[PDB]
Design a protein around this ligand. Sequence first.
Ligand code: HEM
Ligand code: HEM
Lengths: 714, 710
Amino acid sequence: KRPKSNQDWWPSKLNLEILDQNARDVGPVEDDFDYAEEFQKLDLEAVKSDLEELMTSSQDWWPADYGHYGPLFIRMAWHSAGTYRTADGRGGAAGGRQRFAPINSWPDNANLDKARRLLLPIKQKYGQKISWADLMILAGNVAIESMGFKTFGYAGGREDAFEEDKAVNWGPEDEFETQERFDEPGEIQEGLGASVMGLIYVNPEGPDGNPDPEASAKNIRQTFDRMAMNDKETAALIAGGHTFGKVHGADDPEENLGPEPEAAPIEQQGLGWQNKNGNSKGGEMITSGIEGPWTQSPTEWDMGYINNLLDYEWEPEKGPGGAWQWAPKSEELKNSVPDAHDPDEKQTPMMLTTDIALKRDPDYREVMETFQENPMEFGMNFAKAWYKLTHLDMGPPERFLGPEVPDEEMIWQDPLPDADYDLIGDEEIAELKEEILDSDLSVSQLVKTAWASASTYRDSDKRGGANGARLRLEPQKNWEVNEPEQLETVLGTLENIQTEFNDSRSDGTQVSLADLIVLGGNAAVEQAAANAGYDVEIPFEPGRVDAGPEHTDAPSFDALKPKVDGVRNYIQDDITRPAEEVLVDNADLLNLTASELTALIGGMRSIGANYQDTDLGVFTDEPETLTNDFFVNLLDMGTEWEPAADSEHRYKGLDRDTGEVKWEATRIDLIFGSNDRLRAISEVYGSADAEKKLVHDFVDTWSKVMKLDRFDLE
Amino acid sequence: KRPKSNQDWWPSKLNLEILDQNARDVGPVEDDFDYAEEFQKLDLEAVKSDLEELMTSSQDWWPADYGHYGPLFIRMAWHSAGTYRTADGRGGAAGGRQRFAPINSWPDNANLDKARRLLLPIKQKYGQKISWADLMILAGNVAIESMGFKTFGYAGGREDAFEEDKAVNWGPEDEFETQERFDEPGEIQEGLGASVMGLIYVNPEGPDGNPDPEASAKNIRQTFDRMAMNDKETAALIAGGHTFGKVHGADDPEENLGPEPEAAPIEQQGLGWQNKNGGEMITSGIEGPWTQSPTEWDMGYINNLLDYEWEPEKGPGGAWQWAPKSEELKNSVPDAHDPDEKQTPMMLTTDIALKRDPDYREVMETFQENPMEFGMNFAKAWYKLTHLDMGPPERFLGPEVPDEEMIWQDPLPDADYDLIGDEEIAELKEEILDSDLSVSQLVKTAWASASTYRDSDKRGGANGARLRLEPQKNWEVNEPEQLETVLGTLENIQTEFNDSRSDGTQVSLADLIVLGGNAAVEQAAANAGYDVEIPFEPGRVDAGPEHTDAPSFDALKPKVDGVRNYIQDDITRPAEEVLVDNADLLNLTASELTALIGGMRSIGANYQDTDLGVFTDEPETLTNDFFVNLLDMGTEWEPAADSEHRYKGLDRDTGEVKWEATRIDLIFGSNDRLRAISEVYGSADAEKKLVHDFVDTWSKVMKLDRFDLE
Ligand code: HEM
Ligand code: HEM
């Protein structure tokens, strides 16, 4: 049978498994070497040369359309990066997770198992020097280039994952190719990048399977927006992409294709969708169930897509695979395209409902008209959009490796300016820490501010962090959670210190506000530990710079705004999920393990760095003194808990005997004494000789978070 | 909502998560610090003194019955150790996993959340010096001692787990307290230690809820047998345990108790079964004490059971229970809380089972004839029950460990001789390689010796050379005929060496087996062009039949052996699932398992010397050939005709039949995660890494039962 899962018995059980993924690096790789180093040893041009040859080296087990695999590889790359969501930065091509379930078996990724299989020889040849992640995007680039279109650039550095990302919530649906996320097109439930479970963006036949182009445009626009693309970028990508290849639907996929990869027999060795007539038959190939090319020359860059779409009238019909597609009302395009495999046959172009959407929608139409009138403009926008699409989850320019990285840095890379001054030394670091502690700022204020600065980092797409001090810029400076009013006060004091420090130097040395914010936080934690009798020294890495509005796409940073913040015990009154679930989801972005999260929160409550300075979870009589009081008091059976009257997130801790109110807290605090696993960690920290251990573990986790975006140490 | 799992989309997806548990050590504890060292610092007597006081220190949130928590702690300890299964060694008290789901929420563990909570202050007071696992058993011991019965002994050493054991298959049922595992009592499906999902062993009311004691006895006998206990031990444990306390069922549990811990509100802070309404406690739904003095060791249970006639009835909680016919026992027991109230003794269907079943009755009559005999059968059975998953005697720690070692500990003799040195080792290795034994014979034999180890209960392993004794020497998988040949040759080497020595130095056959294996692996590596030096730990001893309970070792027999590509024809689960299950027992991660099998196939050490999975034309040469050829798209795979787990690999262009393989070999090229690992080892410049990873894993397995080093 099956060893069953606690998840099955209790559907609402905290999914700590997502944090366990941060406790180790699954896979055979040794944790002594970084991929960046290995990639640097790669002869990129040699790999591209091999990719070039592969493009026209048809393998019989999966015949190349028109004798060129290029279009297939472009789709592969498109789908690899296409799962990206701006909401949490998850999905995307950075880990090459298209290779693992569930993505590897999504209907929208049908036959991409074969595409990836074609690249295996090249992958084996270069080994660790090139990740599957980097290889898949490079294959897409070489494809495009070999078909007459120079790409804007390419960067390597994507480290391969060895399993799926367990933290990604792909939707509520209990079945692929079905949707329970939108009633009206354009109103998809927030936090999802697609309109249908198992699809990249939208249904190619139209919303809910109805060939309604106008409605389709609403979903296309919303989904692409959730994938960081605007109208011009979306139109450029779709049009540029569909300028190549064709759709496959020789027959109905629901009855002519075998089980997806995950459900396929062991002998298929990782492949899926076995065609009843044999995969070898190019003329019987089935993928989406839709059939036909978009242009007359499917393997050459040109204006064929835009011209076919705009210059002709189209009608909705049922294709050979039984799916909705569009045919031209004219007879000028009849059999105007050669058959993908039969040298003695021809085909007629077709358009997807989603293609017609670009022509029917007013705004998209304006863009397409402009593109048709200005080929160079079309090319320019597609080149930049393709580069963006394939690199948006790689983080800052510091992480872009290789000889093909453009000199130009794009705004979506959240670029950082150079430090035109000498860095502070050890003596200055000690000096500044003392000066910060000697100001009117409290330990709580300093800890709260440093956390506000670093807490925006997310390991999914490497965006956020303390470097740049974007906390002082829009929109962060005005985020409710950051307490704008209070924030300005703290930053003013730190700015004055910066001013006085810089003016007193005579050697060219300067300190950034970004560093002082973190340095003040470290000093505060050290002081808190000192008040408890412990002497700890937090390692500090100077060099963070102060980014300006010119380096910041303000609107794009709103996605990093936390709805729940554990360190500050902040809970937005709009959250749907239980507070603890959001807490775990956010902890994952900071690469925290269950134990680290526990030490962080429990240690923090001893210091007391709450939003609006509440006493929620602050189970101690000596605030700003780092101890294990949180755990000792949380575990005291002398206290009985209950939801607070007329409160949405408040709970009261009452003396079991007297009935007196001893403490107040939220689910963020109480989850550590409720969840079976977290309670086990709490018991360790709440024991008699575990205070020093908690202090050190807290300090280690604090330091870890403060340095998350310092890729220079990576 | 919440993120769905691949498990939900694909129910039959390989559960590699069980192997991932061997990769990292969740929990806040350092990876270096070892528990044995910390327990050594503990003042055991001080802990017992505190537990002694706790027994009569009633806490308002869970008032002690009869003013003594002893019985409750006994039940807590019995349930902690009670989930053990000999089949895989899983379950049991060694990790204190009663603290985590699903066990912490099984209906049979109702209100033990409170029992464990009572121990929290002591746990906090002593910290890392005593694990929850050790403390729960110690609490049971102190309870028994405080109520007038001396225990046989106690050993510390149980390292706390920080999560549930994902490798345990608790059963096929989709609902607690239901059973889809037996059609006739005494015929429960293989591999399960209980007759019902969510219960420790059996239904207290009777099989399928029918109060039939003769039938109940059949399930009691089979389940306890699956937990390593025979008739005398079973009767002694039940009678001894029920000499204490009572069952709680003031009203029906189905409508009077709140949700189990895992489903309880956050404010309950880990507790569950909150009563929705002198002791109105409700646990099992059955109500009443077994004896007149529930907090005193005596013959009350046995006398009440055997000296009176009993009849079944529905108690106040709506459950089956038995009442005595005589009015002599009516109101003979004080109420657990209401001092001005009395109660009549009761028996469970499972207790009446000990009287109605012919064989159990004979045992009980014997117990009643001599309390001293009953007492010691119970003392020894309680010790066994609570220590059977702790491994050999070397792992038993503390001042209360008995000088006497029991056969279930799989004891080992002392080495009454001087250990061999580096020169002797080098010499012996050469001697082995100079014999007519092949690289394959040596690797296979060393694997056969070491592969029986299981991390679940720490049984098995190469120490003791039990491979040469019954029943292992005759297991089909070990190829008896071939094994004898190897052992004979190695035995002659041992004899010659031991005689040649003059300073009293000797070498065990146990060590020669492993040394031979290592030498062979080092040779296989050398054939491929690699110089590897496998570390060797001399000191394994040769156990004899007197240190071996032969029938108990059959539980360690493999149904599937990946290294030897052996698959029993009676397996129910897919071979790859058994492979993963067995890999977990060897503490292997997915990558280690992958390196082990792949590397092993280049060496070629298959059962019956088949070419299954041996994707290389250079056998006994350690390379990454397995992966290179497995991943070659030039080859197409198909199921072998009329085969069970066999496949054929054909060249796609030439039609040449290149290879033969099993699901064991092919899963590494099919499963999404394993294939990613395979691609790494099958890469152009990864052969050296594969060789090293294989060697490291081989060495790891050979040393699994070397606790002396732990
Ligand atoms: C509104 C978004 C889109 C939808 C609904 C969509 C749709 C689809 C469908 C249904 C197929 C055919 C699969 C098959 O049967 O073989 C296909 C393929 C293709 N798509 Fe798109 N697509 C979109 C966007 C994009 C983008 C942004 C790119 C790349 C810049 C790309 C490029 C391709 C290429 C090159 C092919 C042809 C593959 C081949 O010849 O095998 N697509 N698409
Ligand atoms: C498979 C055979 C057995 C069955 C069916 C069984 C059943 C039960 C049930 C139904 C309860 C009452 C739970 C409650 O309502 O509070 C109980 C309690 C008890 N059991 Fe057993 N049991 C068995 C074996 C054992 C063994 C082997 C021992 C220990 C040597 C033990 C010791 C206890 C103790 C001392 C209590 C009383 C708890 C208290 O007073 O709170 N039991 N059992």
